[PDB]
Amino acid sequence: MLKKKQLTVLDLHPGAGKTRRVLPEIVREAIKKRLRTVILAPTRVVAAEMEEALRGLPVRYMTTAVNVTHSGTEIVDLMCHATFTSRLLQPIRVPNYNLNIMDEAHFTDPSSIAARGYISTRVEMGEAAAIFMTATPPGTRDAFPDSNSPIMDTEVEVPERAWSSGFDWVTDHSGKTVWFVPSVRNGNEIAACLTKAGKRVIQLSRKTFETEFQKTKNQEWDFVITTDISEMGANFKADRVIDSRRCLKPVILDGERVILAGPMPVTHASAAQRRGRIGRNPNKPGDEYMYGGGCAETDEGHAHWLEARMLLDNIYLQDGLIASLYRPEADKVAAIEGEFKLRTEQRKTFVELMKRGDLPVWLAYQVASAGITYTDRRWCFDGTTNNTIMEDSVPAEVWTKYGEKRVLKPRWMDARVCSDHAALKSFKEFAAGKR
Numbered sequence: 531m532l533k534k535k536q537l538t539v540l541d542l543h544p545g546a547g548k549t550r551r552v553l554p555e556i557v558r559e560a561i562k563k564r565l566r567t568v569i570l571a572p573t574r575v576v577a578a579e580m581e582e583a584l585r586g587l588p589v590r591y592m593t594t595a596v597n598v599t600h601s602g603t604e605i606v607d608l609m610c611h612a613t614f615t616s617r618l619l620q621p622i623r624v625p626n627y628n629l630n631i632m633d634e635a636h637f638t639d640p641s642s643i644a645a646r647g648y649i650s651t652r653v654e655m656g657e658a659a660a661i662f663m664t665a666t667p668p669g670t671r672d673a674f675p676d677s678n679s680p681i682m683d684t685e686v687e688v689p690e691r692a693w694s695s696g697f698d699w700v701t702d703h704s705g706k707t708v709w710f711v712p713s714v715r716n717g718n719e720i721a722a723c724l725t726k727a728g729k730r731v732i733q734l735s736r737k738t739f740e741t742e743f744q745k746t747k748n749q750e751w752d753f754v755i756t757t758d759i760s761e762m763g764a765n766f767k768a769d770r771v772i773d774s775r776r777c778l779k780p781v782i783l784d785g786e787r788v789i790l791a792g793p794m795p796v797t798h799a800s801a802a803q804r805r806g807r808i809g810r811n812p813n814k815p816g817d818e819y820m821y822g823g824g825c826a827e828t829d830e831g832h833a834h835w836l837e838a839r840m841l842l843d844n845i846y847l848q849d850g851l852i853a854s855l856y857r858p859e860a861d862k863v864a865a866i867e868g869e870f871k872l873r874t875e876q877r878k879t880f881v882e883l884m885k886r887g888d889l890p891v892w893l894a895y896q897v898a899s900a901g902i903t904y905t906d907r908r909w910c911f912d913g914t915t916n917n918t919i920m921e922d923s924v925p926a927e928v929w930t931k932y933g934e935k936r937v938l939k940p941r942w943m944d945a946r947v948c949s950d951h952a953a954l955k956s957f958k959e960f961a962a963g964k965r
């Protein structure tokens with residue numbers, strides 16, 4: 531696999547040992563051939579799992595999730611997918627890695643899609659080798675792949691709100707369950723219901739993942755309520771998965787705003803990854819997978835793929851050339867390569883709005899291309915009356931950096947800035963000039 535001009539899709543079933551057995555072997559061979567190597571982890575929890583698998587091998591961990599003293603003589607770097615894309619965007623020089631290994635290469639966040647497009651373009655140009663590690667590569671139509679032990683699959687009605695009766699099977703269980711919900715707000719309602727019934731519940735989401743995941747090992751639990759984030763390597767010691775088979779989809783309407791459409795069916799890849807959390811111990815057959823809906827290819831027209839093109843149009847590759855999206859996922863967006871390319875100063879603003887401002891890619895692009903500087907927050911208050919952000923059924927309010935009390939009415943409306951209590955609290959601080 532290690533020869534140039536070759537991208538290998540390592541697609542063993544979930545739990546086959548791609549991380550703990552296959553990855554150290556690849557790394558030993560790459561170190562033997564003096565290949566400059568990058569290992570890309572989806573999250574910080576996977577990066578820590580990787581240090582345990584690669585202990586004793588000379589790897590430079592470019593993450594603060596690991597506390598290692600680096601010798602300064604390593605030719606293998608390990609960083610998160612987002613870190614790689616971030617450094618490609620920033621003026622920091624990134625080595626031209628001879629071998630690029632992406633673990634959990636099915637991740638659909640904009641920074642992951644952009645990293646795949648960049649790496650696969652370098653391979654197509656004959657400059658590098660690449661290994662994409664995932665049981666569910668782009669385009670997969672099998673939601674029921676192989677497992678370490680047999681799984682009991684059951685199509686059943688799954689509650690999406692609190693309930694009083696009709697779902698005795700949910701609470702009559704004596705093992706541990708991992709339940710996938712379409713959103714944080716939906717997970718809160720179901721968690722409150724289970725807690726009221728005497729259950730011990732832990733809730734996972736993107737912003738709280740590293741902190742709350744530790745609780746699955748530190749304390750006894752009955753249920754874990756999670757969003758799609760637990761599809762990226764998150765290992766659990768569970769005997770059941772309750773899968774709503776639903777997710778929210780960001781959609782750009784009329785090129786003017788972003789809405790959170792749905793809940794709608796997950797892809798075949800997501801359903802297979804959610805099921806993949808159980809049936810992993812060959813000595814414990816009969817883990818349960820209860821699913822409450824079907825799959826559809828909801829990745830078509832999803833805004834993440836448009837955002838990855840916004841990222842790639844602003845990364846240098848060679849003169850005026852721009853990296854293309856990885857061919858199996860290149861048709862999910864109707865976008866012309868280069869249409870989002872910004873000049874030096876607007877690009878610098880675009881980067882800072884995502885990196886420091888913590889804004890979604892699409893929203894940061896609208897601000898930067900309009901000629902607005904990073905610290906100028908006047909667009910947070912001068913939008914139309916139907917762009918008013920609502921908190922507790924009343925217009926949200928902030929004190930501006932001038933000391934004036936104003937209604938949050940952004941010129942560009944992106945539903946992700948107020949999708950939950952935490953996101954809106956962060957957007958209020960941004961609009962106030964607090965970061």
Ligand SMILES: COC(=O)[C@@]1(C)CCCN1S(C)(=O)=O
Pocket residue numbers: 612613615616617619640641841880881882884885891
């Ligand atoms: C945490 O998010 C990031 O780091 C990414 C890679 C996400 C999209 C671009 N930004 S950016 C400006 O490069 O920081």
